[PDB]
């Protein structure tokens, strides 16, 4: 790999080169960049409607908002800057935008500060068991926003209540808004409270003078469901600008490869993305974001040839890149390729060392 002459000796496996023309390697333009395109990521679902709802539903009657048929931008979980506690399990929040799901839900409720811990997978408690249980396989997130100045009232806000008793614990993501009287002892309650009989619902003591552990916290649990069915809602995909007249890779919505993009007169129908030649190979594509048709000319390549007289004559040698123009570069273009290391002359002689297209080489004074 010192000089092209030495590539000839290692090719022929000989320390002496005779007159002629010899092939040594294959030129190939490697890619410098890469293009990633995808259709527009607008039409976002309004997650702020739940995370910043004007009013929240009670705990025993927690509200759920279904998210489907849109682009779920999960950056609001952190970029909102409107929360006190933010945690996720299984999947990081920065990766949710790349993961597609079948169904997504926003389970909102207002619970005490000490009860924020109960919103966790596999955790037990007054809120986890009787109000809102999470499964062990929960791979979502939870955000608690201190609403001491909003969801509080002196003497206790009676609009926010929860379930303190129930004959049987609830299932994951199960809601129970019944008023059945709970039984503690062996006596029948007769549908009314009494000896060893309590009401199942209880109001919260949310007041503006409450502590950090007792104040109201607007909690929202973003539940995910990855089922066998096809995905219906996914996050925004990463993309960049377009690079033309340069050897680059391709990662389109439905096309991949490597080549060079150029403007052309071709046309793709509204229901068409990428074209093909007779050999099932792609040679055209339409941008998923812009309205343009771009032909895909692949990166240049070609066999490398050396033109040398005999080793006993001289070590001055030319080089020929078959089937490519002068890109990397005593230079002369031919119809066979770019020839470097040779001087063209207007005269004509007998052909000593052929090249192609009627052109020939020789070593003369």
């Amino acid at each position: 790999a010192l000089d092209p002459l030495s590539e000839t000796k290692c090719t022929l496996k000989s320390f002496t080169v005779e007159k002629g023309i010899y092939q040594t390697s294959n030129f190939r333009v490697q890619p410098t960049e890469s293009i990633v395109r995808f259709p527009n990521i607008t039409n976002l679902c309004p997650f702020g409607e739940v995370f910043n709802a004007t009013r929240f539903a009670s705990v025993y009657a927690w509200n759920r908002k279904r998210i489907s048929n849109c682009v779920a931008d999960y950056s609001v979980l952190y970029n909102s800057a409107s929360f006190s506690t933010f945690k996720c399990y299984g999947v990081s929040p920065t990766k949710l935008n790349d993961l597609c799901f079948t169904n997504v839900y926003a389970d909102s409720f207002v619970i005490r500060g000490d009860e924020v811990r109960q919103i966790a997978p596999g955790q037990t408690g007054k809120i986890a068991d009787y109000n809102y249980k999470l499964p062990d396989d929960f791979t979502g997130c939870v955000i608690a926003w201190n609403s001491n100045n909003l969801d509080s009232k002196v003497g206790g806000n009676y609009n926010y209540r929860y379930r303190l008793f129930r004959k049987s614990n609830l299932k994951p993501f199960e809601r129970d808004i019944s008023t059945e009287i709970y039984q503690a002892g062996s006596k029948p309650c007769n549908g009314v409270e009494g000896f060893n009989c309590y009401f199942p619902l209880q109001s919260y003591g949310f007041q503006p003078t409450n502590g950090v552990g007792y104040q109201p916290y607007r909690v929202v649990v973003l539940s995910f469901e990855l089922l066998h069915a096809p995905a219906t809602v996914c996050g925004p995909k990463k993309s960049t600008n377009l690079v033309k007249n340069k050897c680059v890779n391709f990662n389109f919505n439905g096309l991949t490869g490597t080549g060079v993009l150029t403007e052309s007169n071709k046309k793709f129908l509204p229901f068409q993305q990428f074209g093909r030649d007779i050999a099932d190979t792609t040679d055209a594509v339409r941008d998923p974001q812009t309205l343009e048709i771009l032909d895909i000319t692949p990166c240049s390549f070609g066999g490398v040839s050396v033109i040398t007289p005999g080793t006993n004559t001289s070590n001055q040698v030319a080089v020929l890149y078959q089937g490519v123009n002068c890109t990397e570069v005593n230079v002369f273009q031919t119809r066979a390729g770019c020839l470097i290391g040779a001087e063209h002359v207007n005269n004509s002689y007998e052909c000593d060392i052929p090249i192609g297209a009627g052109i020939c080489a020789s070593y003369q004074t």
Binding site: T281, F301, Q322, R335, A336, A357
Partner: peptide
């Protein structure tokens, strides 16, 4: 009388104009 997978077509030594001169 009438591609990029490593396939390449080399040209001939003599062009059609050079054949006609012979």
């Amino acid at each position: 009388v009438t591609k990029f997978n490593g396939l390449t077509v080399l040209p001939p030594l003599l062009t059609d104009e050079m054949i006609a001169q012979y």
